[PDB]
Design a binder for this molecule. Structure first.
Ligand SMILES: O[C@H]1CO[C@H]2OCC[C@H]21
Ligand SMILES: O[C@H]1CO[C@H]2OCC[C@H]21
Length: 122
């Protein structure tokens, strides 16, 4: 199917600015993140693809799994955190939409060196 780079864009990119309270419910579904199960948590970045791709040349930091290919953005970015509620039960996945402005940390790989995993937001 899709590549790791493409999967990252599908799961985490939404350049279309600060996200409603129904945002995650619609987005998690439209991006096919509720196909096999209700993905517990997810984060969407409201910045241009170029700006997110540029993070691969920014601050090198350790990944949560111990690998060394993670990078933290020098500036904060507009992001939306999606967290599954308790009343949420597949195939009816319910999410809590939370907007914020924080630095993002992504793992990069390949040639071209691009984001392939969203590690965290700090
Ligand atoms: O869960 C509530 C929050 O905002 C409403 O609009 C659509 C669905 C909704
Ligand atoms: O499993 C139970 C716990 O809370 C309910 O609401 C939706 C599904 C439910």
């Amino acid at each position: 199917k899709e590549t790791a780079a493409a999967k990252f864009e599908r799961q985490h990119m939404d350049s279309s600015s600060a996200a409603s309270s129904n945002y995650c419910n619609q987005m998690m579904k439209s991006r096919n993140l509720t196909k096999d199960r209700c993905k517990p948590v997810n984060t969407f970045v409201h910045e241009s693809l170029a700006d997110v791709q540029a993070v691969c040349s920014q601050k090198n930091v350790a990944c949560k799994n111990g690998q060394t290919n993670c990078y933290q953005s020098y500036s904060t970015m507009s992001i939306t955190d999606c967290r599954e509620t308790g009343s949420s039960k597949y195939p009816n996945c319910a999410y809590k939409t939370t907007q914020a402005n924080k630095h993002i940390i992504v793992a990069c790989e390949g040639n071209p060196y691009v984001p392939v995993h969203f590690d965290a937001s700090v």
